[model samples]
Target chain A: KIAIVNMGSLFQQVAQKTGVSNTLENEFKGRASELQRMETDLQAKRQTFAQKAQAFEQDRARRSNEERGKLVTRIQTAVKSVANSQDIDLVVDANAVAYNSSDVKDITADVLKQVK
Target chain B: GMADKIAIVNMGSLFQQVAQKTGVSNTLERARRSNEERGKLVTRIQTAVKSVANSQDIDLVVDANAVAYNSSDVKDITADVLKQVK
Candidate 1:
């Protein structure tokens, strides 16, 4: 059976449900302010770790994404599971198809519920 | 004769490259570690896209991000360029 899905919308909804968007900001908010302070002092180059502070940016980003990755994987799997459950053979991204047809069922709403 | 040299570049390939290099662990050991951060992924794609565009003299490079509703007359070089960094 053919099916269509608004993958973009579903991804956005999934990101919200997983709290991956806001959570990453919250996790990095403090570190970001501290980094800003560190950046201002970077001109002085007085702090012993001033040289190291720049390095922290990369490390902090890597660490922060560690959690976001898991959430992404969960959403990906959930989407696939939803498709399989619906017995969809070929699921086309709704944006790709030129014409909308009732024949190609839209599983976007269903997938969002499954993701949530 | 088509004088223009056009090629398609897949961002997913660049994404995988970044994931493998910057990821915390091995794929078999912990596949999740290769998931990669979104920012880094975008950075990698941005760098690669510019580099490829300049080097190859590409006129247009359409990615999945854009609306893929039409334009059936296009050459897809996704596999060709994807093998470069791997």
Candidate 2:
């Protein structure tokens, strides 16, 4: 259960409690409005960042999935190559076979051959 | 007349507050993101530095090697430049 705090909420509270003025309309022109503007900008900026960050992460995940797909395909080709070379019929994920005999050949290297 | 040589001031606490807001993520992740942001900011800083330096015909621009003395006032936008500086 991970939780991310909304910093803008904290800012809103701080601004209000610290007497930064409730009026969205700036009464004083310079620093007072500047703080208000900054507080307002903070929300917009943080929200944009959150949205863009989520999108960026999703984009990265899709790329990773594509790479994983390539790796899996490579592994299938590699396993078949190994089986044909050693004259075997079937190949399965090794960890599942709890009672299997001594391994015939480890194709870990074959799959990792071109994966830099 | 302010002859700008691109004064970059590092505001450490400002960045610290930003990272602390994300307490759930590993602190390293926050720090890495901060560093990556700083990396990106260097380009803009360099551009300003070079333009200011060449504009003033200065031969070199050095990091704030020594804090000799600070005036009682600074007019620069400390916050805007802080992320890049830190």
Candidate 3:
């Protein structure tokens, strides 16, 4: 049998629980915090500093977003594990395709549970 | 004077342009959908901040990086907002 899951919602759940689910957020924050604090104060004053602050912000987002990408990939790995553990032949992201009521099982919630 | 109610978006132009450039936007349909998805993600964070602001009734939310001090009043919803972004 086959199943479908909502990748978007799954990603959201990971994001919500990640602070608890993992230390990636804290690690990024710890690294970025002091500099972020320093620049936020500086950039609040001028356009030039604001541009620098913008660069800092981009770097911060780059780290966090990369971490997010990693977590999402882990969820995909989890999905594959779930598929293997179960007898399911295939599981796909619901957004990737269209189907009728009888076509596939709705395993979105199950996939989310495994993600945590 | 600053606006009475304002908020912040963490994701800026670089991502939008990059997403369009690197994303599968070969045709108009794909590009439109890509932009829309990008727009929705932006909108989702805005909605999240507004939700947090409404709950706390804050006057303004400056760029988080723009704030010099660790603030308790302006409402830092970045953590909460991060969760909502897929």
Candidate 4:
């Protein structure tokens, strides 16, 4: 049987449950405020400020994605376990499915339980 | 029952290729589309992927970006999917 998982929801719940959300916020809070301040102060000289701001934003985005990648890996492992136990032959993310049918099993809840 | 023939599709790659082929990039530097337009494109891509999977006798198809690892035997159907999308 085919299965689907709401990966976005799973990631959010997992991040909150695992304290990754707080950890990420704590790690980037200072820099984020600093960037805001810089944006205000450099409103007149945006030529240089834009580059720095872009770099900071990119760095933050990359870091956040890396953290999520870790969570995705964990989720996938849990998904595989659930799929195998259920004898599911294939699993795909809900985001990728253009049309969701009643026939496909949604394993997001099961995977979340497994993760927790 | 036969062993499941699992396959992976690189959605990012597929989207980019489709966008390029369809001139979505030629008009806009960043290639942003309306939600309706994007939805149509997505539906088309999904149809193409499904067709390719059916033709290949694949049991399951997963997004490559979501998968961390797969054994060597897992087929990468991205190329075939791209052709279908085109």
Candidate achieving the largest TM-score: 4
Steric clashes per prediction: 0, 0, 0, 0
Rate residue B58 of model 1 by lDDT.
56
Candidate numbers, best DockQ first, in rank order: 4, 1, 3, 2
lDDT of 1 by residue, B4-79 (tens): 4333445665566666775623434533434444554665555555455555655445454443443444545455
lDDT at B24 for candidate 4? 54
Displacement of residue A9 (Cα, Å) in model 3 is: 0.9
Docking quality tier of candidate 1?
Answer: incorrect
Winner by DockQ between candidate 3 and candidate 2: 3
lDDT of 3 by residue, A49-98 (tens): 56766776787678778877887887888787777777777675655422
Residue-wise lDDT of candidate 4 within B1-86, one digit each (tens)? 32445677887887777877786545555233655556667777888888887888775677787679988788788888877774
What is model 2's native contact fraction?
Answer: 0.00
When 1 and 3 are scored with TM-score, the better candidate is 1
Ranking by TM-score: 4, 1, 3, 2
Predict model 1's lDDT versus the native: 0.59
Error of 4 at B64 (Å): 17
i-RMS for every candidate (Å) is 12.4, 29.5, 17.8, 3.9
TM-score per model (chain B): 0.49, 0.40, 0.48, 0.80
Top model by DockQ, which number?
Answer: 4
DockQ of 4: 0.11
Model 4 spans with C-alpha error above 4 angstroms: A39-48, A97-103, B1-86
